[PDB]
Ligand binder design. Structure first.
Ligand SMILES: *[C@@H]1O[C@H](CO)[C@@H](O[C@@H]2O[C@H](CO)[C@@H](O[C@@H]3O[C@H](CO[C@H]4O[C@H](CO[C@H]5O[C@H](CO)[C@@H](O)[C@H](O)[C@@H]5O[C@H]5O[C@H](CO)[C@@H](O)[C@H](O)[C@@H]5O)[C@@H](O)[C@H](O[C@H]5O[C@H](CO)[C@@H](O)[C@H](O)[C@@H]5O[C@H]5O[C@H](CO)[C@@H](O)[C@H](O)[C@@H]5O)[C@@H]4O)[C@@H](O)[C@H](O[C@H]4O[C@H](CO)[C@@H](O)[C@H](O)[C@@H]4O)[C@@H]3O)[C@H](O)[C@H]2NC(C)=O)[C@H](O)[C@H]1NC(C)=O
Ligand SMILES: *[C@@H]1O[C@H](CO)[C@@H](O[C@@H]2O[C@H](CO)[C@@H](O[C@@H]3O[C@H](CO[C@H]4O[C@H](CO[C@H]5O[C@H](CO)[C@@H](O)[C@H](O)[C@@H]5O[C@H]5O[C@H](CO)[C@@H](O)[C@H](O)[C@@H]5O)[C@@H](O)[C@H](O[C@H]5O[C@H](CO)[C@@H](O)[C@H](O)[C@@H]5O)[C@@H]4O)[C@@H](O)[C@H](O[C@H]4O[C@H](CO)[C@@H](O)[C@H](O)[C@@H]4O)[C@@H]3O)[C@H](O)[C@H]2NC(C)=O)[C@H](O)[C@H]1NC(C)=O
Ligand SMILES: *[C@@H]1O[C@H](CO)[C@@H](O[C@@H]2O[C@H](CO)[C@@H](O)[C@H](O)[C@H]2NC(C)=O)[C@H](O)[C@H]1NC(C)=O
Ligand SMILES: *[C@@H]1O[C@H](CO)[C@@H](O[C@@H]2O[C@H](CO)[C@@H](O)[C@H](O)[C@H]2NC(C)=O)[C@H](O)[C@H]1NC(C)=O
Ligand SMILES: *[C@@H]1O[C@H](CO)[C@@H](O[C@@H]2O[C@H](CO)[C@@H](O)[C@H](O)[C@H]2NC(C)=O)[C@H](O)[C@H]1NC(C)=O
Ligand SMILES: *[C@@H]1O[C@H](CO)[C@@H](O)[C@H](O)[C@H]1NC(C)=O
Ligand SMILES: *[C@@H]1O[C@H](CO)[C@@H](O)[C@H](O)[C@H]1NC(C)=O
Ligand SMILES: *[C@@H]1O[C@H](CO)[C@@H](O)[C@H](O)[C@H]1NC(C)=O
Ligand SMILES: *[C@@H]1O[C@H](CO)[C@@H](O)[C@H](O)[C@H]1NC(C)=O
Ligand SMILES: *[C@@H]1O[C@H](CO)[C@@H](O)[C@H](O)[C@H]1NC(C)=O
Ligand SMILES: *[C@@H]1O[C@H](CO)[C@@H](O)[C@H](O)[C@H]1NC(C)=O
Ligand SMILES: *[C@@H]1O[C@H](CO)[C@@H](O)[C@H](O)[C@H]1NC(C)=O
Ligand SMILES: *[C@@H]1O[C@H](CO)[C@@H](O)[C@H](O)[C@H]1NC(C)=O
Ligand SMILES: *[C@@H]1O[C@H](CO)[C@@H](O)[C@H](O)[C@H]1NC(C)=O
Ligand SMILES: *[C@@H]1O[C@H](CO)[C@@H](O)[C@H](O)[C@H]1NC(C)=O
Ligand SMILES: *[C@@H]1O[C@H](CO)[C@@H](O)[C@H](O)[C@H]1NC(C)=O
Ligand SMILES: *[C@@H]1O[C@H](CO)[C@@H](O)[C@H](O)[C@H]1NC(C)=O
Ligand SMILES: *[C@@H]1O[C@H](CO)[C@@H](O)[C@H](O)[C@H]1NC(C)=O
Ligand SMILES: [Cu+2]
Lengths: 601, 139, 601, 139
């Protein structure tokens, strides 16, 4: 009443319509059916039998109690089946006989206590099984169920407290398997259960005894081992002894978010020497001591959401090899100090966002000796003052993010001087005066400039301006800049622009003239003051690839007839035509231009 | 009435049933069906309980060609001996059982048989009622 | 509608009627409402507010998702509330403000993962809480739940795997508590958690680690400890080692059913010396060794459903203190042997039912020396031949049950001779000839004799019969005895009879003459061939307290007017009057006699 | 609209809400309500998820006397930081949460305030919407 046609003859959204059967009007060609929140107490061989082409079927929370014999008989092409949140009493042996090539099965919160609820003997190529939020107490798969193709096995939020050798043997044929045991408190692991085990991901989130984990995982090889906990768990402190078993396994990446380390000292991490990445998010760190051992070949470190007072309190000498450091969302003001990171010779990425950082001189002292640095994030901080050449210490920089950080720059100063490799610069809501004309000197390679929410004198972009020197610029964002006008020669020297966002300003059609030299662009003119678009502008629009004119006070009178005809013939080229409406005459106010046909002289 | 379900079809033996409780259906699948029924079969069974099952008994009434072969009664749950982990569950609970039943071995002569299986409590109130047809053929 | 009125103004069964509200036709005085299997997606302050006198309310499987503020506001007198099998999303703080004297609450299979789902701060006198078949993983009671009157806490079928000191201290204020953990796989118990603990019952049915339980229960005092397993659980190896912890515990009664004991060590029970009762039902026992230490003061032993060949294989020398012994449902034919129980001098009750016992001469050899036996059960066995004084070895018997066991007794023999204290004798289907004058000699104290399914020569009870020696007889069951007639003097010596069941025979009305000397009896004549009851029999009927004439071919013509008039005058002497129907004339067939008035003049 | 529920009525502070998601209601109870709200209150909360909650954000919009006091946003679940055990659960799942919310302490001046609380995913699709009245009065 009625299903939403998302793609003609292919994809239908029937959610929340209180339906008791597939609508007669759904075509036989349907491939993607979104049927969640309907009412199907029993499903059976007649239910879906005409929908022979389904590849995706979502029956989330459809009040299904019964799946009778041959229910999916016609779904030979089924790739994904979602049966989440149905109060299932029984599933017939031959229910899944049809979808022999099924890849992904979601059986979350179906009230089951065992995988043998689900007769899976017809699924020889399954890739994903999601069994979260049930009564399950064992990871063991049904004997003879093929696992060669299994990549994701997910048991989040179950009643699994023990992993046996026999449990694990049921998984041996899979390769690069990810096993999600998040929300299962592991009380024991059978010694030898993890002999020669290989996993892509292994998640034991929220588990209450880490000693059991590190001992139990002896001999396994794991890419990402997720051992974080949560705010609603009342976890015991981590004692140094807990990490001993890590000596007898191979792990690339470990997450320990929200834990509390008791008695942090020089040897606590000795067993971490093989680790490539360590994430210590929100672990109540107010400092780390130096002389810490076991972390000197670590590449990636996360110390976000902690409570350092000073960047020097992280003791960077511990991590000579780092290529990535994140320390974002520090719960106090992070004082940056001087050369506090100078040790990090090979640092390539630094994230210091949301750190309440405050300084009236930046950033050569703070970033001292970080000359391999390629990406810097200083977004969402307090006001920063930048003198000319403020990033002298980081000449190889390719991305610089200062979004939502107010910037204080003096007249004719060039803070980005000598950043000859910078490709991406985000200055959203930095509140710079963009008429300061040395502003962007030293940026020959810049391709992407985001200037959303900055300031232009009198809301005009002048014929000569600070953007002119940016010869390789491809992407320019000038939305929310309170622009009234753009001089027709403002952009003439920017010949490689292909994405120009001028949305949420007060522009008229005269602004289009500034794009006459460009072809094939994306041009966003949404939420401006465009009304009439005269014939002499139409060749400029015809030149572009996509144009967004939604939420403009478009004129739907004969005075705008050439644009209105152009619009009907150029629907390919137009984005959001559904929100592109007439302002006048009053009769046509709020009517889509796509629904207007005038007769003029 | 309720749909006819197949519990079992292999090794020459086919078991088809219909719930004879007007109130509801139930699900049943039998593993390792054959004309030579092995002892202690595994089944899967799903139902909503209409009575508590602290005291639960099974009647079997077997016939062929319009006359009685066998009547038999057997307790599943009793106060002095709950045989199964599901004993003592209560009215309204959804039950799923996948496990053994400890029947004796038996060979089924080719032919067709009508089986009435009834689960009931100490007051003879219906917990489940199955009207089954069992067909044995050459294999 | 239409609710079944079970008790006028008091008790209504509205189960399975698809109701969305309480019917307006239910009186305000309703005290017991069975409302299961209806449809109440939300319940709230208006749902029940007029039913102020409810003491019992069952909302089992009513599709309730929401319980809002003050739902039970008017149920001040509520004793039991059943919310089992409802898919509850939330229950308001004040939902149970009304029933402050609530005693028993059932919240089984409601999907809850925590006891704090149920706001119970208003229930200060709670006695029973049933939380089975949920996702609960701890027994810990929430802060400020009164435990003082709590006697039953039931967690059958949950996800509890550990019992800590903290968990156990949350129960300290309760006394004499029965805690059911059946169907929870307990993998650990915190040392000290059971220090000084005192329980009525503790059930760990099905648990996979008996060693853990006994060790964890150190220092506890338990009246009944139920540690049986089930047919659908894995076996663990049973040896003396498993029970070591029992030596540091006080237990009165223990059940170990269905564990695999077969080929038991003589040292298996050495820790059981404090036990009064031991249950080894269905434990695959084929014999017990002599010198089976640790049970010399055991009082009650259950060895039912095992596989002994002979009674001598229980080695009764092991149990000199036994007062009760049950060995029923043995899976092989049991040979009783001779003198196999002779050292059980204290034995008072012996159950040897369902054992396929057969013998040419019972029961002096088999029961040799059981001089204190008071109750003996030999029901459901194969044929026993009894000679005169068959129970000389047990002169003190008060109850003897031989139901469904064929007895072979030679002509003029008195098998029950010198059982001068026997009060209850069940010979249902023993197929004895009840006309033999000597059959029941020696039963001067007999009060209760069940002879359902026995026989008299030619379906007639003669003036001389076996019963005339039973001067103290009160209860006589002669139903299904294929009786055509009873001589008027058949029961004349039986002056203390007050309950005579003659149902399911073919008796006609003159059978009533056999009760002529009796007053105030219960007389069951159901399912006979009584049609006409002539006036001279009516005074006999008037003398009695209760008569059941249901399912007789009763005559509702003028040939029967004297009885018909009597019937109307004496409804208070009649049982099952709603199934006491006319058979003739055809016009009145199936009409209740209570609805008949004839005029004959 | 959905019923008005009382989340809280203690220590001079009353909190009443109404779900403003037309699709459904939700349950909420707050423990240790007062005019001097301590940090890290415990709540009890139940709902059906209408979106997956791998990414979950809260907006708070506060006002009094038709005047906007505070607009705040806060993430509950993110890829780089799931804060809660419920993070990652999926559309259709029934959720019950009984646990702490990591709120700051604060005294609440006498008067009547209007609160809009909104839980949404990365596409701003509604998970929950509560429209609440907070009344502070002397105690
Ligand atoms: C001495 O020892 C005796 C034996 O141990 C004790 O016997 C007990 O006696 C009482 C009566 O006093 C009786 O209680 C009633 O039970 C009703 C339910 O009964 C079910 O089971 C029985 C017995 O089954 C066992 O025996 C048969 C016969 O050999 C066998 O075939 C079975 O497989 C089973 O044996 C197996 O299990 C046992 C126990 O584990 C093992 O020990 C043994 O090795 C085997 O493994 C059945 O016969 C019943 O079925 C009949 O009745 C139902 C209707 O109820 C019919 O639907 C069914 O088709 C069948 O019909 C047959 O009999 C009826 C007559 O009953 C005929 O009409 C018909 O033609 C058929 O022939 C059941 O499956 C229970 O309903 C009843 O409830 C009543 O009272 C309660 C409360 O008091 C009220 O709620 C109700 O309103 C009722 O009025 C009552 O409780 C026990 O059944 C019986 N126990 C045993 C084990 O036999 C005896 O008590 C003891 N003496 C003393 C003094 O203590
Ligand atoms: C450099 O670092 C920064 C900062 O770390 C990175 O910033 C990220 O930038 C991306 C790209 O723009 C953003 O992605 C988008 O996210 C939205 C959802 O946003 C929600 O969070 C917003 C931010 O909230 C934080 O900050 C505010 C303001 O300071 C603060 O008030 C909040 O409390 C919160 O801060 C806290 O949390 C942090 C993280 O845990 C802590 O670090 C910190 O200390 C604080 O505790 C928030 O503003 C927003 O609310 C607004 O928007 C919504 C509508 O969405 C509106 O309803 C509200 O009222 C607000 O106006 C949200 O709550 C997501 O919706 C977007 O999703 C679209 O796009 C993606 C991919 O493009 C698609 O997949 C989707 O389908 C969809 O279309 C998008 O993902 C991101 O939010 C931002 N992250 C943070 C933490 O700020 C930046 O990426 C880095 N640079 C580089 C180069 O990597
Ligand atoms: C769905 O299954 C039903 C039930 O088996 C099928 O209906 C039966 O079809 C056979 C063959 O035509 C008949 O002999 C039976 O009498 C039918 N039974 C009933 C109850 O109608 C039905 O054909 C199947 N439908 C589809 C589309 O597969
Ligand atoms: C500032 O702008 C840049 C460029 O658009 C944003 O960078 C993207 O960030 C996302 C993660 O947020 C990455 O997956 C993309 O690859 C980045 N893009 C590029 C081109 O590198 C950045 O997110 C913006 N910052 C803020 C705070 O919004
Ligand atoms: C034989 O008859 C006797 C007497 O009615 C039955 O004994 C009763 O048995 C039950 C247990 O089934 C006890 O709870 C009662 O107390 C007994 N009554 C008396 C007076 O003792 C006995 O059950 C019958 N046997 C069979 C096999 O049916
Ligand atoms: C969609 O179905 C209709 C009717 O068959 C038709 O107009 C249109 O061509 C179809 N498009 C497809 C199959 O892609
Ligand atoms: C789809 O298939 C059915 C047969 O299953 C056929 O009769 C009909 O033409 C098709 N119906 C629709 C609505 O497309
Ligand atoms: C696991 O054990 C084997 C055999 O002892 C050994 O070859 C291998 O190095 C070990 N692997 C890991 C990852 O520890
Ligand atoms: C600065 O970086 C270089 C790496 O090029 C390193 O050799 C030197 O030690 C660093 N300086 C300090 C003070 O650590
Ligand atoms: C079994 O099924 C047949 C019809 O298929 C019917 O005649 C018979 O009465 C059924 N028996 C019961 C007990 O329902
Ligand atoms: C089974 O019971 C029926 C109906 O009561 C009876 O007629 C029949 O003879 C019994 N069958 C057997 C094999 O004893
Ligand atoms: C039932 O209630 C009515 C009140 O309408 C009363 O007249 C009647 O006496 C009651 N019946 C009994 C048996 O208590
Ligand atoms: C139920 O509560 C509503 C809403 O609070 C109230 O208006 C109404 O008076 C109450 N009705 C009853 C019967 O208590
Ligand atoms: C039943 O209760 C209603 C509402 O509480 C009340 O108005 C009325 O007095 C009661 N009816 C009778 C017959 O007592
Ligand atoms: C419990 O331990 C105490 C102190 O050791 C001991 O005296 C007492 O007898 C024990 N009680 C039981 C029931 O084991
Ligand atoms: C028989 O019983 C008496 C007690 O009545 C006892 O002293 C004697 O030992 C018993 N006989 C045997 C052989 O055990
Ligand atoms: C809050 O939001 C409103 C509505 O978008 C906005 O007008 C106002 O700026 C905000 N108010 C405050 C005090 O932050
Ligand atoms: C919210 O609800 C109040 C009543 O609770 C209503 O009067 C108001 O208009 C609503 N406001 C918003 C912003 O949803
Ligand atoms: Cu010992």
């Amino acid at each position: 009443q009625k299903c939403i046609e998302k793609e003609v003859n292919k994809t239908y959204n029937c959610e929340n319509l209180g339906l008791n059967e597939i609508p007669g009007t759904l075509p036989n060609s349907t491939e993607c059916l979104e049927f969640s929140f309907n009412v199907l107490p029993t499903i059976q061989n007649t239910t879906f039998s005409r929908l022979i082409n389904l590849t995706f079927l979502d029956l989330t929370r459809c009040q299904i109690y019964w799946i009778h014999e041959d229910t999916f008989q016609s779904q030979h092409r089924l790739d994904t089946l979602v049966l989440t949140a149905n109060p299932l009493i029984f599933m017939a042996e031959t229910a899944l006989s049809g979808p022999k090539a099924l890849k992904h099965l979601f059986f979350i919160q179906t009230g089951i206590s065992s995988i043998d609820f689900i007769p899976l003997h017809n699924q020889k190529t399954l890739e994903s099984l999601y069994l979260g939020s049930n009564h399950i107490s064992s990871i063991k798969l049904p004997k003879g169920f093929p696992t060669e193709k299994l990549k994701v096995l997910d048991f989040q939020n179950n009643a699994i407290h023990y992993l046996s050798k026999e449990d694990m043997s049921s998984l041996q044929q899979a390769t690069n398997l990810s096993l999600n045991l998040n929300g299962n408190d592991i009380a024991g692991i059978e010694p030898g259960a993890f002999d020669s085990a290989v996993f892509q991901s292994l998640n034991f989130g929220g588990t209450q005894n880490l000693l059991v984990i590190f001992k139990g995982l002896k001999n396994s090889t794991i890419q990402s081992l997720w051992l974080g906990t949560f705010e609603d768990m009342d976890d015991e402190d981590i004692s140094p002894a807990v990490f001993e078993g890590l000596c007898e396994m191979s792990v690339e990446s470990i997450n320990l978010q929200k834990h509390y380390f008791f008695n942090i000292s020089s040897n606590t991490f000795h067993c971490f020497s093989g680790l490539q990445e360590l994430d210590l998010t929100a672990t109540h760190l107010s400092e780390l001591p130096s002389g810490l051992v076991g972390l000197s070949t670590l590449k990636k470190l996360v110390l976000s959401a902690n409570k350092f007072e000073n960047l020097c309190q992280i003791s960077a000498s511990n991590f000579p090899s780092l290529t990535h450091l994140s320390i974002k969302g520090n719960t106090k003001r992070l004082e940056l100090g001087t050369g506090c990171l100078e040790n990090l010779e090979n640092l390539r990425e630094l994230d210091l966002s949301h750190d309440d950082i405050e300084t009236s001189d930046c950033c050569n002292l703070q970033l001292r000796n970080l000359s391999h640095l390629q990406s810097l994030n200083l977004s969402y901080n307090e006001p920063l003052s930048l003198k000319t050449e403020a990033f002298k210490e980081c000449p190889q920089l390719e991305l610089l993010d200062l979004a939502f950080t107010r910037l204080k720059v003096k007249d004719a100063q060039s803070p980005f001087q000598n950043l000859h490799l910078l490709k991406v610069l985000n200055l959203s809501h930095s509140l710079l005066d963009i008429s300061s004309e040395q502003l962007f000197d030293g940026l020959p390679a810049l391709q992407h400039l985001n200037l959303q929410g900055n300031h232009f004198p009198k809301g005009n972009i002048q014929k000569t301006n600070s953007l002119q020197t940016l010869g390789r610029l491809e992407i320019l964002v000038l939305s929310f800049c309170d622009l009234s006008s753009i001089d027709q020669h403002a952009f003439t020297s920017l010949k490689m622009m292909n994405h120009v966002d001028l949305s949420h300003n007060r522009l008229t059609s005269s602004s289009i003239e500034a794009l006459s030299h460009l072809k094939g662009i994306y041009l966003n003119l949404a939420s401006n003051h465009i009304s009439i678009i005269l014939p002499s502008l139409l060749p400029i629009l015809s030149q572009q690839r996509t144009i967004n004119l939604r939420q403009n006070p478009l004129d739907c009178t004969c005075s705008n007839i050439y644009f209105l005809e152009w619009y009907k013939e150029n629907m390919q080229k137009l984005e959001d035509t559904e929100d592109t409406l007439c302002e006048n005459p009053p009769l046509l106010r709020g009517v889509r231009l796509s629904d207007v046909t005038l007769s003029c002289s | 009435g309720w749909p006819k379900h197949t519990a079992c079809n292999s090794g020459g033996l086919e078991v088809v049933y219909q719930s004879c409780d007007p109130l509801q259906d139930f699900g049943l699948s039998i593993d390792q069906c054959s004309k030579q029924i092995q002892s202690n079969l595994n089944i899967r069974f799903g139902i909503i309980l209409r009575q508590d099952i602290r005291k639960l008994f099974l009647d079997i009434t077997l016939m062929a060609k319009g006359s009685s072969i066998l009547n038999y009664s057997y307790p599943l749950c009793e106060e002095d001996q709950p045989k199964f982990s599901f004993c003592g569950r209560r009215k309204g609970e959804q039950i799923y059982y996948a496990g053994p039943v400890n029947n004796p071995g038996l060979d089924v002569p080719q032919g067709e048989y009508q089986l009435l299986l009834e689960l009931y409590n100490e007051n003879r109130a219906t917990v489940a009622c199955a009207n089954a047809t069992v067909t044995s053929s050459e294999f």
